[PDB]
Symmetry: C3
Subunit: 336 residues, 3 copies
């Protein structure tokens, strides 16, 4: 619309929350198009990714791996203030796969330590989309160092199934999956480095094998298990957004299904249904909607089970409620 119209749209600042949780939002849009404002500070920091104290110099949007999920509605504008503190050592930027132009905004947001930038783009396509850092010449290094996340652009009228019936979730979680490539010495021990740049050469060699040393959810092996398992109750409707900015994954809810899965992550593409295991290509986000029918622990995993159970890509859902013997029952328990 006109120049005045855009300038007159309401501006609204939103407080982000760390994954797997998601900031406050409404499924059906409230009011007309708005300029939704977010601010994220980039943090280069050492994080431990496994039970052996293995370290990675993470490059983290808002200080987390994955970066937080930003939620807007179709035709709203997302206006991000991106800050790169003087304490960091590298230049960073951001590419929103949801955006149109300049490498998703990457060409307009190259900021050195001590600089900030503000990017605005119109969210013209509904769906979940990956966002990731992409500095010319060092794109994969920043992405596999954890500098990626996703956003969700909801249809202004909320979600719907293939027949146009509304799909309203009770809660939503964002599972960011990260492939890491940590160098090892000749004895097989993971190496540690003083500064991010010190690990560059060694890391690229591991990257070229196309074989991650770790594949994790929310930044570490077991980050979404135990006391940090995601939760739900029988009867509750849950949307699970999943992203992988660099490598393929195949999510599976063990003991459950994806009732409606936008495998490509785009809401104008009708969702597949009754899915056992869906597929999200590297460089994309997907979303699955499920209504829980049984209480208990569910294993939510990348279904290359070696990646899930040897490399780290396994999360848990802890569900409360009444067991349904119609759906499943032990007719004869394990016995001699």
């Amino acid at each position: 619309a006109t120049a005045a119209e855009i300038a007159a749209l309401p501006r609204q600042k939103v407080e982000l929350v760390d994954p797997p949780f998601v900031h406050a939002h409404s499924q059906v849009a409230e009011g007309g198009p708005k300029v939704v404002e977010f601010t994220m500070v980039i943090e280069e920091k050492k994080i431990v990714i496994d039970d052996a104290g293995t370290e990675v110099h993470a490059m983290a949007f808002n200080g987390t791996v994955p970066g937080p999920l930003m939620v807007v509605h179709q035709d709203d504008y997302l206006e991000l203030t991106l800050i790169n503190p003087e304490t960091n050592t590298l230049m960073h930027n951001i590419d929103f796969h949801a955006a149109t132009g300049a490498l998703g905004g990457g060409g307009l947001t190259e900021i050195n330590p001590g600089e900030k930038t503000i990017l605005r783009f119109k969210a013209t396509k509904p769906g979940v989309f990956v966002y990731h850092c992409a500095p010319p010449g060092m794109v994969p290094w920043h992405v596999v160092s954890g500098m990626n996340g996703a956003i969700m652009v909801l249809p202004r009228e909320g979600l719907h199934d293939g027949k146009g019936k509304a799909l309203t979730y009770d809660k939503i979680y964002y599972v960011g999956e990260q492939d890491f490539y940590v160098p090892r010495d000749e004895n097989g021990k993971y190496k540690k480095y003083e500064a991010p740049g010190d690990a560059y050469e060694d890391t690229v060699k591991v990257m070229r094998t196309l074989t991650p040393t770790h594949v994790v959810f929310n930044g570490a092996v077991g980050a979404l298990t135990g006391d940090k398992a995601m939760t739900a109750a029988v009867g509750e409707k849950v949307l699970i957004v999943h992203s992988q900015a660099n490598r393929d994954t195949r999510p599976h809810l063990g003991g459950g299904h994806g009732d409606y899965v936008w495998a490509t992550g785009k809401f104008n593409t009708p969702p597949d249904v009754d899915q056992e295991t869906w597929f999200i290509p590297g460089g994309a986000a997907g979303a699955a909607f499920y209504t829980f029918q049984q209480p208990g622990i569910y294993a939510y995993v990348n279904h290359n089970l070696i990646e899930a159970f040897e490399l780290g890509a396994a999360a848990h859902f802890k569900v409360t409620g009444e067991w349904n013997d119609d759906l499943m029952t032990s007719v004869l328990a394990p016995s001699g």
Copy 2:
């Protein structure tokens, strides 16, 4: 349904057959919901997977790799009696991706050698689904030792295309694809062991490379070729169910196509059509429907040709009938 209502349902005992063949069943359901009974004994046994005499310590449902295809209709109940003989050395269980609750039944079917269990679940969603063993802490190991198969939950009214027209097959085959990780000694020779447990440590190291040493159909290189080639005739409609419990595959019928392909394996998701090569993610099963139009040998392969022709993922179809020159003809045969 109530326990009493379920108790009043008719029961039907099914006799399983070894892949790639499928037990007798009817495409369109005969009568109302029933409790379909199956029994499978678990057999830990050595299997030779290539012509170099390479061995794998298979953990096989019903004694085969893959385990047999079980066929029921939507809303029937599948009641499996699973037996772990005292001659085996490990605990095993079963997780049906088609089921709802307790890790697909895995949590209710953990049986030590000498024990048996009976699980019943309601087949509420139509499609082909993977089933696999998943002992806590030893999941990928059992799955990549061949302990997986699939089931098909047919719509009560049989198969239909995306427009509701019936699709009725003349023959059905089940191709289970398996990635194996066989340890090698310093001289590049595959190692042999006299106990499943003895190979654990060495196998986990190969599994972590995410690079299988073998990728085969029906448990071994050449298992579905030569004398075990699948058969059909021109004009015959064939359904090919394919599963891969741990790793991605991309089936292709050389010389033919997938006229209708439920790539996600779920019948409520309209099938793709006129497919050259489809994709099935690790942890899932898919199904392709084709009407043969030409006689001859067809190469059915995982289309990463290195996996098909160097690693073993290739099968054959031998088709009888009249050649169709309209569809294809050699105008000029190979000549100087």
Copy 3:
């Protein structure tokens, strides 16, 4: 149709052009079914695939990697005269995934050096399809030496979206992606070989790692960049056909989207829409339609960013036109 009916159809000889360009054609078919004639000479030739000077003994249809795109309409007949010059040293053939019978024509086109053959087949199914050499016992070696390309079988009424609306492109490009497996010496430097056969054993060993040393577009790292970047203008509609005869890929247009993507490459399968990153399994071709909205440089990549930026799978689009600040704008340029 009968032999007589086919002999009565008009014939049109087409001159092929080198990828990423496509020979002249009409989107909507001109007239009734035709026998469209193509000729390709196979050339075993040395090609350099990177700036370091790495060599590959390519097996090239029409002298290029990928082989050229052949375009016909559904129900036309494709008649290919395939020539294997006496200067070559290996037997070759061709398997058209678009064809029905004899392994896509492979069983009828085995020609030794000094021979030629003419194969004709009816293009019964619409879509883009891979074609590749496949000599019994040496299949993957020929394919990963670059002996593959694609054809496009357009619907007689041109392309349409999933709801029947016509989709007419202004330009079309064919991006062939090739995984290469180049042997290295003890210093980690790529090896060169006098004759192609000399490289066989070393190459098969690399192939078995399932880890390509290079993944490139149009035969070489950076082949579609610089003066050879693809081009478009704001408002221009472009169809991008992409193929990978042996390995999966996940195309992404950086700064843009796939407005309509026939990810399976088959036109009778409704296209996905508003795609960020699509997926084409090894052994298939896919096609994406996009209307450019912003000027500037776009990175078209396989979105496993290691494969794109370390291995070579990255191309550029140079787009002329006016910047759209409504779609995207730098509110605050990088500043302190």
